[PDB]
Write a protein that binds this ligand. Structure first.
Ligand SMILES: CC(C)(COP(=O)(O)OP(=O)(O)OC[C@H]1O[C@@H](n2cnc3c(N)ncnc32)[C@H](O)[C@@H]1OP(=O)(O)O)[C@@H](O)C(=O)NCCC(=O)NCCSCC(=O)O
Ligand SMILES: CC(C)(COP(=O)(O)OP(=O)(O)OC[C@H]1O[C@@H](n2cnc3c(N)ncnc32)[C@H](O)[C@@H]1OP(=O)(O)O)[C@@H](O)C(=O)NCCC(=O)NCCSCC(=O)O
Ligand SMILES: O=C([O-])CC(=O)C(=O)O
Ligand SMILES: O=C([O-])CC(=O)C(=O)O
Lengths: 429, 429
């Protein structure tokens, strides 16, 4: 009997995994997986195997994998709206479950996220009174924190539920949060950039991305395709990245999914992290201010470097090759906006930057990351408000971080609480 | 020539340390400080030496140290208001600098934090419109996020300053943030619990704690002493704790001090972390509802345990003995409120809980932590709104987390970005 329900699937899946991690540990918990050095400690855990995070794994050479699904595999395997890009809905199923969803599963997420998309009065109010000089990421983060009012997990906890059921309430709050996100984000968009206009209604019959673009006010049929791709690729990037790790850390203390997501956003807002989005365009924007020669392009790069600044959109803590998320984006531009001068500049930079970065001899990875390519795509379609880009990153990232969050709690992962040391104490060790 | 200035002191101190960490690393960066096991990965980094954090170090047996200054040492060494408890101002100097401040240094922090204490209009507005069912911690966190508008670091960064000067702007924003905190917190207090009343003005001539208590509306001369002690002891607890670690992680991405503090708060708000504050009182509050026997006291404890719940205020990730912060508090009660029935219940529990926890055989540390003792103190003085307690914890914690934050940036600590693994991948390793 019956029809589609992610929660039931999960109910079936949890005990097996539980069982599976127990024996593994019973046999191997004692096993040394690595060592910790002094440089690692001073170095931001660089190179330390610190967390279990199941939804995605980053290979330094190959790049991100969703099951063991690469981006190009996703692109072919995940259901599409009709009509060439993968629906972030399907990605979400994939991440949660480990399996490739059917079109019909996918429709279910769509409807589910449409049903759940509703904003409480206090939230709307706060967003409506925010100053226009308050950054969109700040606006977003405060809004999601303020939504915790509504937390199903925070409520069940307060009621004294057995730990065993945590995942259940986490799941509800995750689905709800993902559902609301586009409304919050679009409301910020509309307030800042389209004063006096309204986000309108969510239509149950559309996919999440399309409802988002409607609320954003974009009609271009290719913009919608761009959106689907964007929100899919920005999903997740393993556990060690600042935003995911923050959610993981905060979630471990049993703060609800809203609070943990919001802290994650404060992390995504940092220039070395998601804000790179924005930083890239601002830098391109300056570049152009000051059709240039490779030599003048190179002078420009050196001047940033010589000034004690980073070249945004290049480098990576883990990647050692060009990010497939970058390629992914380039391949979209080549199809759709090949003559765009911004695009051309970004293509040109790919020829120069890494070479300059190799010359300088500091960056361990001289190749571009996702952020070097995303804004150019947006700007083409009319979305030229750069300080907003990270908000989009923010919306996507919910998909991976919440998908894992549910597992953490299902698996009963404890408080994240490593040991710290001072220099004097290490000196003494 | 001249008078007092923390920033100048720091300017003198930074290069030396810089120098000191460089050679150390030049000789020992390669040195294995420890190993990583499978259980550690699944276990929340339990037992992993993961971070350098200089302001304080936690010993599993002895408990927290400020330089190498214990709580009892602090209590005797740090300047007081006139008149028995240590001023959190002095603690702050201690943490930043490594040295015990003079009364005169201490006065300087006081005046400085009084000068800087001003709330921007949009913040006041938002706080005034917040619903009363929005938790005080949520209210606090959204408020501090919304303050980033004003970030000196976020502004300098945007301007393209050289990395080398980061610490300078971090310091300003830290001093400013610490200054504003009590205004924000008191405003929440006043809105929720004293509708229609106003926080009033900060008086440059008082210490931070006293201005706070005034804004809170408390006149009891002993309440003020309690406050000073509270905000001092709650300061810092090394780097590995959820809140400090979150600030550290978020700060590493170069999100400004406001954003990083706010994320820290989302972490403090979790039940396994600071919210324990509140959880303890709520549990005591229930206990009493349902002058009891040790046997009925024990039945009560088992029922929580059997229900898949934690006994709040007991246990610790790192401590293996009774928290000196607990003793510290007990010693205050014994002096000031020895006949208080809530106090008596908390004294009685200390005789029972750990024994029940030893019986159960799960807790690795069966002894109480700071949170088991703090609320009882507050309730005595009239501050009985338990959902607010974590806000106080929040205010104090700024002291340690911001003191370190400045050093991280001074020392040029990089992005915190460990490697994660999935179970399948570990299975395969
Ligand atoms: C992404 C990174 C933070 C990784 O940091 P890391 O693992 O510590 O880098 P690394 O090991 O190559 O660093 C060695 C040195 O090269 C420097 N370096 C690395 N990338 C860059 C860059 N793009 N421009 C200039 N210098 C750089 C690095 O800052 C350091 O200098 P110093 O020792 O004086 O501090 C870094 O490459 C960077 O700052 N990139 C620019 C900002 C950026 O584009 N961030 C987005 C990252 S990926 C997608 C996302 O997260 O949103
Ligand atoms: C503070 C702690 C999170 C440390 O967690 P940990 O390092 O994973 O604890 P542990 O190593 O003793 O855990 C072994 C087992 O004992 C359980 N245990 C530990 N403390 C408690 C407690 N107070 N009540 C019942 N069970 C407990 C623990 O949850 C676990 O059960 P299982 O294996 O099925 O998940 C924990 O002791 C706890 O949950 N305490 C109650 C909440 C609390 O008071 N938190 C405040 C911590 S200190 C000050 C602050 O941070 O604000
Ligand atoms: O992996 C990282 O450290 C950052 C990154 O590319 C992402 O989070 O998308
Ligand atoms: O050390 C910890 O994990 C928690 C704690 O006591 C604090 O942060 O005050």
């Amino acid at each position: 009997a019956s029809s589609t329900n992610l929660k039931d699937v999960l109910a079936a899946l949890i005990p097996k995994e539980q069982a599976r991690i127990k024996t593994f540990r019973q046999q191997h918990g004692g096993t040394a997986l690595g060592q910790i050095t002094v440089d690692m400690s001073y170095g931001g855990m660089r190179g330390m195997k610190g967390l279990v995070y199941e939804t995605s794994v980053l290979d330094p050479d190959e790049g991100i994998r969703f099951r063991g699904f690469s981006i190009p595999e996703c692109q072919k395997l995940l259901p599409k709206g009709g009509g060439g890009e993968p629906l972030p809905e399907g990605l979400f199923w994939l991440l949660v479950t480990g399996q490739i969803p059917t079109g019909a599963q996918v429709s279910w997420l769509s409807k589910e996220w449409a049903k759940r998309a509703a904003l409480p009065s206090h939230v709307v109010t706060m967003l409506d009174n925010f100053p226009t000089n308050l950054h969109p990421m700040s606006q977003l983060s405060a809004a999601i924190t303020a939504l915790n009012s509504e937390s199903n997990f925070a409520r069940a906890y307060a009621e004294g539920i057995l730990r065993t059921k945590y995942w259940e309430m986490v799941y509800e709050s995750a689905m709800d949060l993902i559902a609301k996100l586009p409304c919050v984000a679009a409301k910020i968009y509309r307030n800042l950039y389209r004063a006096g206009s309204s986000i309108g209604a969510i239509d149950s019959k559309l996919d999440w991305s399309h409802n988002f673009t409607n609320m954003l006010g974009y009609t271009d049929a290719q913009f919608t395709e761009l959106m689907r791709l964007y929100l899919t690729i920005h999903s997740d990037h393993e556990g060690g990245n600042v935003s995911a790790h923050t959610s993981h850390l905060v979630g471990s203390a049993l703060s609800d999914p809203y609070l943990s997501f919001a802290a994650a956003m404060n992390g995504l807002a940092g220039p070395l992290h998601g804000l790179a989005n924005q930083e890239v365009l601002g830098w391109l924007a300056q570049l152009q201010k000051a059709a240039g020669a490779d030599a003048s392009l190179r002078d420009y790069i050196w001047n940033t470097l010589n000034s004690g600044r980073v070249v945004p959109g290049y480098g990576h803590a883990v990647l050692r090759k060009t990010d497939p998320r970058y390629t992914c984006q380039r391949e979209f531009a080549l199809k759709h906006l090949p003559g765009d001068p911004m695009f051309k500049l970004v293509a040109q930079l790919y020829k120069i930057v890494p070479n300059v970065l190799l010359e300088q001899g500091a960056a361990a990875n001289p190749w571009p990351n996702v952020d070097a390519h995303s804004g150019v795509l947006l700007q083409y379609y009319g979305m030229t408000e750069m300080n907003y880009y990270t908000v989009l990153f923010g919306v996507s990232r919910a998909l991976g971080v919440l998908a894992q969050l549910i597992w953490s709690r299902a698996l009963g992962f404890p408080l994240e609480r490593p040991k710290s040391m001072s220099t004097d104490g290490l000196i003494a060790l």
